[PDB]
Design a protein around this ligand. Structure first.
Ligand SMILES: NS(=O)(=O)c1c(F)c(F)cc(F)c1N[C@H]1C=CCc2ccccc21
Ligand SMILES: [Zn+2]
Length: 257
């Protein structure tokens, strides 16, 4: 199936998913000098007070912390968005080395990892229906650099040994995603896509300028995960990032400067 290697990684995805060569693919390099400050953008509103995490899950490509999105709870609005987008899950992409791992880049800089908080536009009723619309999803992307530990991340890291392998899940309740946010909500935004198959062109990307710091020990725990299932040869889950794709007609807008 698809994955991140030589014979099934990103340069192969187009054969099963021809939109991989589409007009609004993600991620992209954010050229900060070219991004246009847009004084009409609004502050983002990230309203995570009542978020209810349910499970954390390893799917063989990443791991994802899930939320109960059956009620008007943890919502993203404002910024570039029209309407209300409800948080459904977050996940990460990361590298084998601290010098790579992010999907987006900033003036060609790669971060050690990238957090994706995925939200769906409530006007489409479900995340699945939302994924068929060109304004269906909004992903808040946050870069991770290696330095001091992020305390709010540790509950996630400490459960990973219980989900080492593809298909494992754990009861993951009362996790507060506010502990994963940097101080500043300054951002870049552009229209793009899922970064994994099926690569749907359904995402408004909102990429925060300010990275969070995680410790070397925290990211080493991500790198102990496996892309295989239990009882299969160990494949470390590392380098699960799609490289930057052509910007094509698009303009990246800045909320700041
Ligand atoms: N970056 S991503 O393509 O993985 C992503 C998006 F860009 C997006 F807009 C919505 C998503 F749900 C996902 N990630 C999930 C895709 C399938 C299930 C799964 C399992 C674990 C981690 C993430 C995801
Ligand atoms: Zn992602």
């Amino acid at each position: 199936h698809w994955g991140y290697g030589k014979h099934n990684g990103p340069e192969h995805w187009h054969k099963d998913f021809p939109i991989a060569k589409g007009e609004r693919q993600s991620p992209v390099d954010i050229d900060t000098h070219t991004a246009k400050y847009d004084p009409s953008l609004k502050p983002l509103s990230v309203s995570y007070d009542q978020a209810t995490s349910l499970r954390i899950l390893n799917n063989g490509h990443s791991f994802k912390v899930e939320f109960d999105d059956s009620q008007d709870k943890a919502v993203l609005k404002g910024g570039p968005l029209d309407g209300t987008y409800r948080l459904t899950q977050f996940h990460f992409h990361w590298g084998s080395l601290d010098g790579q791992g992010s999907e987006h880049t900033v003036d060609k800089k790669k971060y050690a990892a990238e957090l994706h908080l995925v939200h769906w536009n409530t006007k489409y009723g479900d995340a699945g229906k939302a994924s068929q619309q060109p304004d269906g999803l909004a992903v808040l992307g946050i870069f991770l650099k290696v330095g001091s530990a992020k305390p709010g991340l540790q509950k996630v890291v400490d459960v990973l040994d219980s989900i080492k392998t593809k298909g494992k899940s754990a009861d993951f309740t009362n996790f507060d995603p506010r502990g994963l946010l940097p101080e500043s909500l300054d951002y870049w935004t552009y229209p793009g896509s899922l970064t994994t198959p099926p690569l749907n062109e359904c995402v408004t990307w909102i990429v925060l300028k300010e990275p969070i710091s995680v410790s070397s020990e925290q990211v080493l725990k991500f790198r102990k995960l496996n892309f295989n299932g239990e009882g299969e040869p160990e494949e470390l889950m590392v380098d699960n990032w799609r490289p930057a794709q052509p910007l094509k007609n698009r303009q990246i807008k800045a909320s700041f400067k």
